[PDB]
Short mmCIF file of C-alpha atoms and ligand atoms in Angstrom, two decimals:
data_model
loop_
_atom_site.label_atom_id
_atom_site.label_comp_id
_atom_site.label_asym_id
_atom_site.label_seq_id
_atom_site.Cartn_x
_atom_site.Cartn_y
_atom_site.Cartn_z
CA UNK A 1 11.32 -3.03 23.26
CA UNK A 2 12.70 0.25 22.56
CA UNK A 3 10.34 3.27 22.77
CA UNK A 4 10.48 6.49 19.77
CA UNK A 5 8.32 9.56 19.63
CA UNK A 6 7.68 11.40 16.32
CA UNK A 7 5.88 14.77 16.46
CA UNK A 8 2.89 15.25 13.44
CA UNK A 9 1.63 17.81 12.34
CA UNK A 10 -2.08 17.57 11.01
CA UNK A 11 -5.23 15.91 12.55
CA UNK A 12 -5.50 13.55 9.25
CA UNK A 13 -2.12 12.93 9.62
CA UNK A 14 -2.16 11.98 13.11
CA UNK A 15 -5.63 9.58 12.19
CA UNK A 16 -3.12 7.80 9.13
CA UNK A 17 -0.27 7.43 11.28
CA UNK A 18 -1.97 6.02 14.43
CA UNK A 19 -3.93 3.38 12.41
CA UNK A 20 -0.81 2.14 10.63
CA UNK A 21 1.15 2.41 14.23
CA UNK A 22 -1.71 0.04 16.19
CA UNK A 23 -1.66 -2.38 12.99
CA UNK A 24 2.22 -2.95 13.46
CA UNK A 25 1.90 -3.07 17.72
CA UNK A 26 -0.81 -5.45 17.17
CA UNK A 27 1.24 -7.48 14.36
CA UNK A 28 3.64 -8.12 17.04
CA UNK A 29 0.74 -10.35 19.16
CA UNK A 30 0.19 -12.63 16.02
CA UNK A 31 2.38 -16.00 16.32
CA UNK A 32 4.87 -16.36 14.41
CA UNK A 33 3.04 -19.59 12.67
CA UNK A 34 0.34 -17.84 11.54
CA UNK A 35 2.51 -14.21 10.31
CA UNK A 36 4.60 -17.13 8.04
CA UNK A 37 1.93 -18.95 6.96
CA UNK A 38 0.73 -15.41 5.88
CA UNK A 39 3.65 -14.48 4.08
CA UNK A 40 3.50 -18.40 2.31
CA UNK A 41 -0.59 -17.65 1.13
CA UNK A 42 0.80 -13.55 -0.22
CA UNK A 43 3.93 -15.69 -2.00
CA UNK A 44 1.24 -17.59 -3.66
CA UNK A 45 -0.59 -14.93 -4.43
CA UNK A 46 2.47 -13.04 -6.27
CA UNK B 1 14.84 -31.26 21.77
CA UNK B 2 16.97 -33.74 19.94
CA UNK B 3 19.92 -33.01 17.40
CA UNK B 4 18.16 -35.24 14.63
CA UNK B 5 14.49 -33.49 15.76
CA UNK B 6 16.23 -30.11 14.61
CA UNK B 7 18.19 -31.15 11.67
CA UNK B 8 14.00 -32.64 11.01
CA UNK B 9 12.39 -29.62 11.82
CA UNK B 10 15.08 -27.44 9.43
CA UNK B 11 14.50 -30.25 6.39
CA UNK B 12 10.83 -30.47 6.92
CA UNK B 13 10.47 -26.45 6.59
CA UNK B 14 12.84 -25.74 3.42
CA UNK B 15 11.95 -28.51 1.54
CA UNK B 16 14.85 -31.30 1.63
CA UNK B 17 12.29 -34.76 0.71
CA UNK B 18 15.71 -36.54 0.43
CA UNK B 19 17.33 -35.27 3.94
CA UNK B 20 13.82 -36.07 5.50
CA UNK B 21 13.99 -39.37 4.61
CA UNK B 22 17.52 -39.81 5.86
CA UNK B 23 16.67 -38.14 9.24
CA UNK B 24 13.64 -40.73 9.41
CA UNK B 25 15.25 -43.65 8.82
CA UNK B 26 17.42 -42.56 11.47
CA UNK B 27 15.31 -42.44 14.07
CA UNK B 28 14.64 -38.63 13.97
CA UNK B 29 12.25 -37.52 16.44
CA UNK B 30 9.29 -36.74 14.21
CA UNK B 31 7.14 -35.23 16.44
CA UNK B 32 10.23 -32.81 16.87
CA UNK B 33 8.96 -29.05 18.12
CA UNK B 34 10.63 -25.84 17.07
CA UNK B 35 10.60 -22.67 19.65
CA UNK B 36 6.90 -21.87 18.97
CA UNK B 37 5.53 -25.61 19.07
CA UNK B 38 5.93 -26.44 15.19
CA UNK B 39 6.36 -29.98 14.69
CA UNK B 40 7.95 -31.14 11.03
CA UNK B 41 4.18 -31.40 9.86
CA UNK B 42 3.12 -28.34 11.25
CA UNK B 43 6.26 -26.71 8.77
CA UNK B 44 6.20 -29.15 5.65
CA UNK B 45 1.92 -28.14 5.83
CA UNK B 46 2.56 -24.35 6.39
CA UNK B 47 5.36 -24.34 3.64
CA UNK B 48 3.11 -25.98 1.47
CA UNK B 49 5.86 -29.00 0.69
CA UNK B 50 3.38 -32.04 0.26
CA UNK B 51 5.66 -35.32 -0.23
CA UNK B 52 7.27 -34.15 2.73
CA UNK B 53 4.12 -34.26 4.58
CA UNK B 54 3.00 -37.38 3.38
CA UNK B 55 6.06 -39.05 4.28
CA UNK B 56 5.89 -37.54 8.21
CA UNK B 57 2.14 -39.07 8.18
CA UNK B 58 3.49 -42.01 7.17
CA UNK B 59 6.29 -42.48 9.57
CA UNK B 60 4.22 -41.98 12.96
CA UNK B 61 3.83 -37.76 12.66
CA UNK B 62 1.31 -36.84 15.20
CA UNK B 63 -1.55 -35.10 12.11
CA UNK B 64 -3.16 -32.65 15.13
CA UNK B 65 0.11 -31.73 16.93
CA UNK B 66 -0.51 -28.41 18.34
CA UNK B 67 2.04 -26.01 18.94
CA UNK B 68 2.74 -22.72 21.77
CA UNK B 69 -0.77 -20.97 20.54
CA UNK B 70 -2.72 -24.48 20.25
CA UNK B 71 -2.04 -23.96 16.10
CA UNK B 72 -2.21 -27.24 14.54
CA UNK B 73 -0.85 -28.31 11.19
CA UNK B 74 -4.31 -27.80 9.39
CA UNK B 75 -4.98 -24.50 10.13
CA UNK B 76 -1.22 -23.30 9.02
CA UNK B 77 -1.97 -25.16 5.49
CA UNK B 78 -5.66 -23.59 5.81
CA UNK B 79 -4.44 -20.07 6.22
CA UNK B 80 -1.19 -20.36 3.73
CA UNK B 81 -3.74 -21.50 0.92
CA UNK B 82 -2.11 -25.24 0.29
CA UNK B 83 -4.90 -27.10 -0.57
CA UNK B 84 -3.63 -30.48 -1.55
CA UNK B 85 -2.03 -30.63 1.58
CA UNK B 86 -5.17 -29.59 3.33
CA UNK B 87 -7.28 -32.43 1.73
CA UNK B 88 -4.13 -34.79 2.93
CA UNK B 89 -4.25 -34.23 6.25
CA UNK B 90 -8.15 -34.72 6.50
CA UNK B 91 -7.58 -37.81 5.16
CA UNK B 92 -5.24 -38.85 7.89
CA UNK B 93 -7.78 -37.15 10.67
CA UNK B 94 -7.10 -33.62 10.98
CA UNK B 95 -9.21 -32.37 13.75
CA UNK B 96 -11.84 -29.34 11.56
CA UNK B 97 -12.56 -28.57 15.42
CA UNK B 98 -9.47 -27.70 16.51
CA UNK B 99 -9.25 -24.27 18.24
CA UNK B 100 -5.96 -22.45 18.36
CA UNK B 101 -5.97 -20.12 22.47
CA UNK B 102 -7.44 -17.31 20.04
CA UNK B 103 -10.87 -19.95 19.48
CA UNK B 104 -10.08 -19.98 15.67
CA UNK B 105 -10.69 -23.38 13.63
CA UNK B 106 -8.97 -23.79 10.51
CA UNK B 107 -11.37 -23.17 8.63
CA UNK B 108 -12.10 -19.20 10.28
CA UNK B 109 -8.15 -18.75 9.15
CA UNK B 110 -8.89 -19.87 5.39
CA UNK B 111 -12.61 -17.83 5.56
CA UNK B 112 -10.33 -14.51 6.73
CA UNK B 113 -7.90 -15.38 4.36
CA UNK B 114 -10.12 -15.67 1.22
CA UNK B 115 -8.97 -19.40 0.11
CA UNK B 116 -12.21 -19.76 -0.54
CA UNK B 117 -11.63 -23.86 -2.28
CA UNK B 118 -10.09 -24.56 1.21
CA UNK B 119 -12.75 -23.06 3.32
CA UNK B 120 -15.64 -24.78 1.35
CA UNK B 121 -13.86 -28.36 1.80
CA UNK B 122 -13.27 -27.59 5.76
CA UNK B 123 -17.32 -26.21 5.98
CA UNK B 124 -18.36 -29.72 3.73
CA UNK B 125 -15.67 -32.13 6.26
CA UNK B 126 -17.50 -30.29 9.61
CA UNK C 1 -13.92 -6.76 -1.99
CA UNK C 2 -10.31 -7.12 -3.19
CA UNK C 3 -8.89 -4.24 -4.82
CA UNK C 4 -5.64 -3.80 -6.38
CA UNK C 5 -2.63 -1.35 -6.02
CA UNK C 6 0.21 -0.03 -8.72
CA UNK C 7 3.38 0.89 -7.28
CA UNK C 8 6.39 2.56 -8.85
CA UNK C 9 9.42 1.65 -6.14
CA UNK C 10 10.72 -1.25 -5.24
CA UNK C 11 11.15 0.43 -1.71
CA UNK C 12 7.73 2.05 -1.83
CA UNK C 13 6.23 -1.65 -2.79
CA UNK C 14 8.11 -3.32 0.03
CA UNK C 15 6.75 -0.26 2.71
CA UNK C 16 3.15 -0.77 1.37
CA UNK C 17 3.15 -4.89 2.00
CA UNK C 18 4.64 -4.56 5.29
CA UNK C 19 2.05 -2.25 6.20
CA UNK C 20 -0.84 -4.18 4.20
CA UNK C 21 0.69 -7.39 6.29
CA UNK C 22 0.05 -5.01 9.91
CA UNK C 23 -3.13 -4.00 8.67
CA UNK C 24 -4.66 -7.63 7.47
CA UNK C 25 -2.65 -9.74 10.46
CA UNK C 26 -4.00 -7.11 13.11
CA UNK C 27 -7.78 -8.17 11.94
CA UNK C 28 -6.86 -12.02 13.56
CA UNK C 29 -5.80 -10.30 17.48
CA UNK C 30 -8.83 -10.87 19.88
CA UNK C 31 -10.71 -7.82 20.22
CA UNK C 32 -10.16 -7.47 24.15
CA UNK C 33 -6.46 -7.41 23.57
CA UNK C 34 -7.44 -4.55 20.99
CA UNK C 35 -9.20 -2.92 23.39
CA UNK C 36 -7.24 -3.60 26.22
CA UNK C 37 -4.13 -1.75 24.33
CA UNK C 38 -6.20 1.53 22.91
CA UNK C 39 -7.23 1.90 26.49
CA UNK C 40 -3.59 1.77 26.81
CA UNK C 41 -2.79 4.16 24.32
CA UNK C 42 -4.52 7.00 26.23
CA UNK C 43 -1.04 7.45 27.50
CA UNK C 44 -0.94 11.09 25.34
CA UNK D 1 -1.40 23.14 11.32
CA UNK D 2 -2.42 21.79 15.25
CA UNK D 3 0.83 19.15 16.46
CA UNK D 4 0.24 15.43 17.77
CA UNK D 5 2.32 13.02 19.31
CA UNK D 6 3.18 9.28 18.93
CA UNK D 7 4.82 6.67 20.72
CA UNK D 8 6.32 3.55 19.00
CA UNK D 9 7.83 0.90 20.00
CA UNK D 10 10.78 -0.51 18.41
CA UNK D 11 13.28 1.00 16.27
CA UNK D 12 12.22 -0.91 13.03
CA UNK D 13 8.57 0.32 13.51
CA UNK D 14 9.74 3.77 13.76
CA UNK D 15 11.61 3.55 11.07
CA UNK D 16 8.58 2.84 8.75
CA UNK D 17 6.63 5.59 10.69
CA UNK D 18 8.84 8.39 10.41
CA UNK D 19 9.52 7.10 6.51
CA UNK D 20 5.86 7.73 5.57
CA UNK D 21 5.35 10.89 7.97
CA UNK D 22 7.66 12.23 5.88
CA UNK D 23 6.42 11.81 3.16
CA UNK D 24 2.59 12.91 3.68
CA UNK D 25 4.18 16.13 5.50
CA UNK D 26 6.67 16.83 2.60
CA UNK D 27 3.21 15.67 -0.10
CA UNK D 28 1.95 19.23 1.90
CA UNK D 29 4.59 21.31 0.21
CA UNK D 30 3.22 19.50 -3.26
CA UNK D 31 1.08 22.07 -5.24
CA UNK D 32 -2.95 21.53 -5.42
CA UNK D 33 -3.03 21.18 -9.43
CA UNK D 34 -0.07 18.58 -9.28
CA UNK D 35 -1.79 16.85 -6.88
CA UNK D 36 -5.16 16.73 -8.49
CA UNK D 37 -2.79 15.97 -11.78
CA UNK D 38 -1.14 12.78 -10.21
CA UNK D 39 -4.84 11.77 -8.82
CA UNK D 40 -6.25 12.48 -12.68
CA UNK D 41 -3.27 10.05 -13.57
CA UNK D 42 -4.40 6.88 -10.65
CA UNK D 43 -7.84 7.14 -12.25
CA UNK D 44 -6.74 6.39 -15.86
CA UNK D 45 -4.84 3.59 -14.19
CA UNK D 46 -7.65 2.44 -12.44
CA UNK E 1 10.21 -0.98 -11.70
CA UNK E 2 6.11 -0.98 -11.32
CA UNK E 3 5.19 -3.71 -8.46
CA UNK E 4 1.62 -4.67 -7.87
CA UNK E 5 0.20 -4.91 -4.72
CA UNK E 6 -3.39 -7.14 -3.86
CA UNK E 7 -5.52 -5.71 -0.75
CA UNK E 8 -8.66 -7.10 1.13
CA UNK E 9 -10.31 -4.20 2.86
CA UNK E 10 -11.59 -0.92 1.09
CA UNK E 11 -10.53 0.55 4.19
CA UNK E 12 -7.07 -0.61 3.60
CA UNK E 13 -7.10 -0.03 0.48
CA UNK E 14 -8.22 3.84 0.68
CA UNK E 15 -5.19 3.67 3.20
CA UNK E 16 -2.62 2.27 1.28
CA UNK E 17 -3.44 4.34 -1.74
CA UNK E 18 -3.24 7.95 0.73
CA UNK E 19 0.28 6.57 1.47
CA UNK E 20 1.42 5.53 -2.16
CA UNK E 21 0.58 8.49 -3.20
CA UNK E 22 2.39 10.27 -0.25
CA UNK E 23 5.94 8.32 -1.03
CA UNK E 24 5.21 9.00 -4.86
CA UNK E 25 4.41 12.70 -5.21
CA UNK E 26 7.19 13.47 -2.42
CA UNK E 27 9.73 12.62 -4.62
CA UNK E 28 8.79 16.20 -6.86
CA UNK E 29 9.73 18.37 -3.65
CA UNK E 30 13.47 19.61 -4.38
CA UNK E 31 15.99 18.12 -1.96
CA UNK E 32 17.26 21.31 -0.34
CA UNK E 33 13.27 21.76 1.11
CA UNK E 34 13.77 17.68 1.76
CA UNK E 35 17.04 18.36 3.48
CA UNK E 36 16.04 21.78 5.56
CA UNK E 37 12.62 19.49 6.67
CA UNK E 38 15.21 16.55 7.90
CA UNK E 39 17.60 19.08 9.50
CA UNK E 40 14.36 19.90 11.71
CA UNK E 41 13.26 16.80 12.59
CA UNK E 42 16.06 16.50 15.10
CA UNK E 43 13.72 18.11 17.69
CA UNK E 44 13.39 14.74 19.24
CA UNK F 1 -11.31 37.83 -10.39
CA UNK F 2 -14.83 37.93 -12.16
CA UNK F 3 -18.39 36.14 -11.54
CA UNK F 4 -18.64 34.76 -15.46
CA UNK F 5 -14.36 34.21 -15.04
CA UNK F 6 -15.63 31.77 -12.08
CA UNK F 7 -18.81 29.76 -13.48
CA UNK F 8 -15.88 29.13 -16.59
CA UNK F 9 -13.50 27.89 -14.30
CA UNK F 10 -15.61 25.25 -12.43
CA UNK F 11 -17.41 24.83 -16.25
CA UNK F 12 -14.09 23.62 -17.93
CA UNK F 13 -12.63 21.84 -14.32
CA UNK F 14 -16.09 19.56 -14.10
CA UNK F 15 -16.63 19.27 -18.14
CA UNK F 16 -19.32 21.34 -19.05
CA UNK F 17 -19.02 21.94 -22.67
CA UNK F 18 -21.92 23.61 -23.17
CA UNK F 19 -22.25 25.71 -20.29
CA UNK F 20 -18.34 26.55 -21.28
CA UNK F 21 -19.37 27.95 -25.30
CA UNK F 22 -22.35 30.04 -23.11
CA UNK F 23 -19.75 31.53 -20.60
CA UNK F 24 -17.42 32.61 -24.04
CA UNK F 25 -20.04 33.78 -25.69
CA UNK F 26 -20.96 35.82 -22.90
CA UNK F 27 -17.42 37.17 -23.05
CA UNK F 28 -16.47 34.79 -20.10
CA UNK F 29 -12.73 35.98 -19.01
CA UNK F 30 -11.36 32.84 -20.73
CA UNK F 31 -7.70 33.65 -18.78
CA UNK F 32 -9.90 33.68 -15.51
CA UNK F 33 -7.37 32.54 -12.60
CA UNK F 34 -8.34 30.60 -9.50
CA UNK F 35 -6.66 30.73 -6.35
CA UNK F 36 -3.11 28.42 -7.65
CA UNK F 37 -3.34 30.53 -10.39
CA UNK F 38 -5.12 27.75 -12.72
CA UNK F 39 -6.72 29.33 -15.82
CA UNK F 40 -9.83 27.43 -17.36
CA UNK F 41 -7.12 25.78 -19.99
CA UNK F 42 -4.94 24.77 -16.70
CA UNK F 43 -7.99 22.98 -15.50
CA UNK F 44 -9.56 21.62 -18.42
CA UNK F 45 -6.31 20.00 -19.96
CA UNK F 46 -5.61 18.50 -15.71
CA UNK F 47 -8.65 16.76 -16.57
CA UNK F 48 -8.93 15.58 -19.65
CA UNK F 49 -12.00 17.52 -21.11
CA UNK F 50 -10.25 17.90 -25.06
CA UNK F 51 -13.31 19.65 -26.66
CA UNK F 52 -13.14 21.98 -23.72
CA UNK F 53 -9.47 22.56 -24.34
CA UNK F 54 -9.91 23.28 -27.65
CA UNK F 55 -12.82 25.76 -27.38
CA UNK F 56 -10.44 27.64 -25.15
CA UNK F 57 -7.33 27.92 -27.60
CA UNK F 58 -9.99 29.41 -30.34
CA UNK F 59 -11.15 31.71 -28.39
CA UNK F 60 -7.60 33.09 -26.66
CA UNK F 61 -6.72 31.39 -23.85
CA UNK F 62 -3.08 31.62 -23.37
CA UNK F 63 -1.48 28.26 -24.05
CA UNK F 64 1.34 28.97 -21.70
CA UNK F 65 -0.57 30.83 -18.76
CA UNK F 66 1.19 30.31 -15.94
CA UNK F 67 -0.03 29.09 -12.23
CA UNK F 68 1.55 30.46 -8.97
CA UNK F 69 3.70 27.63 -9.11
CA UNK F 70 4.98 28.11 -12.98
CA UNK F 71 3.11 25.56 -14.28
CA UNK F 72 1.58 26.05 -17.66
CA UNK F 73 -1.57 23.12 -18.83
CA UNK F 74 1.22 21.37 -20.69
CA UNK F 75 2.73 20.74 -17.00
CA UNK F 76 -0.62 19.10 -15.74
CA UNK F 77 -1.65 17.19 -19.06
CA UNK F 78 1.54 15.89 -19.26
CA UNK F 79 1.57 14.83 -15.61
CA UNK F 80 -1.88 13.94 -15.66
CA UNK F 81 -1.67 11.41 -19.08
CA UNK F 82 -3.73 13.08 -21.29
CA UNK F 83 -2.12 12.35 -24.49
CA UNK F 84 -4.62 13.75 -26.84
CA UNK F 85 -4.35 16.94 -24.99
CA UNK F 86 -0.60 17.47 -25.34
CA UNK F 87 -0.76 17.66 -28.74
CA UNK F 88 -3.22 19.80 -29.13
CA UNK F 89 -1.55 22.11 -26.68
CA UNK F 90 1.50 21.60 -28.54
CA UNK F 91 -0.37 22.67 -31.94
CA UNK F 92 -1.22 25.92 -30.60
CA UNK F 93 2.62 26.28 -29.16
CA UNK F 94 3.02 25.32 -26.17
CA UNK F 95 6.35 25.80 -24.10
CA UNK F 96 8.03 22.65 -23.58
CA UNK F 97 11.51 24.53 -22.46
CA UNK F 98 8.90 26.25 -19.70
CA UNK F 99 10.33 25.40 -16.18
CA UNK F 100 7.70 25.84 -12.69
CA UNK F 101 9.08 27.29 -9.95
CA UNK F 102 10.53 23.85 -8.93
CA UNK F 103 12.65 23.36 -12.13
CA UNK F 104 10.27 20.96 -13.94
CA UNK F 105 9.54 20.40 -17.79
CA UNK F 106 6.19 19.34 -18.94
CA UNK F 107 8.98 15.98 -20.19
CA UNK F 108 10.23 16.01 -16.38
CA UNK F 109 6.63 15.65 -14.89
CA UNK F 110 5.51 12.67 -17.71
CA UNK F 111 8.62 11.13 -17.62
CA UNK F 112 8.29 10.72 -13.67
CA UNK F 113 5.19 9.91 -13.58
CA UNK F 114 5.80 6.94 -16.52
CA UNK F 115 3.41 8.64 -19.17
CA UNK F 116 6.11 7.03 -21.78
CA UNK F 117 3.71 8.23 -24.90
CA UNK F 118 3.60 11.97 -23.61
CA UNK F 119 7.76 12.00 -22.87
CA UNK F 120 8.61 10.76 -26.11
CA UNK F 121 6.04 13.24 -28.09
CA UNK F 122 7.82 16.09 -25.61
CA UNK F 123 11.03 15.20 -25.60
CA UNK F 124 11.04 15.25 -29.90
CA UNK F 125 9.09 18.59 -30.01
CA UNK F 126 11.85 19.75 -27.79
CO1 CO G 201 -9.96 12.13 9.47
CO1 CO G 202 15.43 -0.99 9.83
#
């Protein structure tokens, strides 16, 4: 629950770097179930 | 929780048929629930490990269990892409209807997923 | 509609499916809670 | 060349963060023509 | 040593493939420039 | 720089054979730099346009021009995968000992970037 701040430089890079940092925050709200069955469909799939 | 239930829950999930049948015929709690809700279905289903799920139907496993976010065994199989095991547990009365606390029926989970075989058979068994 | 990726990297693979899991998984969270934590995110 | 700012939680999330703002900072310092040469390259692959 | 790597999503996949070719064509900068951009990081 | 220099640089970057033999004929500076340094053999030979890269070595474009970062077409070609274009770059003698401003061989650049065919065709001409 530990909080980090990085510094970026660039308005694209910002844009790529906020999208990828919501996706993992928002990861975190999936149930567990449903993140392993997930990972059990992309095992599969490789 | 129960010290057979957990020892049912860990053999159900990594595949031990043999150990599951040991842990049933000892009375194991099958309807056994891990810290999010799974029963021993709900992980045999997920993990896709089919004889083991059989055998839980068999022995008195509850087939719509539904764990801490109203999952239930059919959607985990749904969204893993396990289809025998799918087809299985209609066949025992998995519950097509059944809406985890984020609305979603198994069937949305395969759709989003792309196991397209699995969605078609959950759209047909509406 | 699915597209595939090389990658040279056994680290670089492993970064890219942890972020392709964030990116597909995040698609399931209720839009509200979405909203409710970008509305958040006006923190900076 | 304009400067943002993130917050992350949790250490393992900035970890991945600061792994690939490194690199798309340091890809800056890349020259154009072996840039456009390694995109030349992905679209023989694909 | 070349991985594979499936993705649903052109937007996710445009994504992905801005970062794979980020952690690829890093590896070309010389590590003293690597090192001296590290060394400054420690602003935070 | 120079207007005809120009039109042959975005002529033999985008593939334009013909409008490339007009430009030469027209005594087109054929070692015509853009702002990396790239001559029109630098961009041709990045992407892949052989015929173009050929009218340029028969009609004097240095085969070892160097950008503002040191590297020469073999560099790009190499790095790029155009196979077919390192040899014919390699006819007409191009430097495989010549090092950018970073260190890098032509051989360096392929061999990172796993164009096997183009190391192995460097690394003997060595
Ligand atoms: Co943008
Ligand atoms: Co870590």
């Amino acid at each position: 629950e530990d909080t980090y701040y990085l510094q970026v430089r660039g308005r694209k890079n910002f844009e790529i770097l906020m999208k990828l940092k919501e996706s993992l925050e928002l990861m975190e709200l999936v149930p567990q179930p449903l993140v392993d069955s997930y990972r059990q469909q992309q095992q599969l799939l490789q | 929780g129960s010290d057979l239930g957990k020892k049912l829950l860990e053999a159900a999930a990594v595949g031990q048929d043999d150990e599951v049948r040991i842990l049933m015929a000892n009375g194991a709690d099958v309807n056994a629930m891990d810290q999010n809700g799974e029963t021993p279905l709900h992980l045999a289903a997920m993990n896709g490990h089919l004889e083991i799920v059989e055998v839980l139907l068999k022995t008195g496993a509850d087939v719509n269990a539904s764990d801490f976010h109203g999952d239930t065994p059919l959607h985990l199989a749904a969204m893993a892409g396990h289809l025998e095991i799918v087809e299985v547990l209609l066949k025992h009365g998995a519950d097509v209807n059944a809406q985890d606390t984020w609305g979603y029926i198994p069937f949305d989970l395969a759709a989003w997923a792309g196991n397209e075989d699995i969605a078609e058979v959950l759209q047909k068994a509406a």
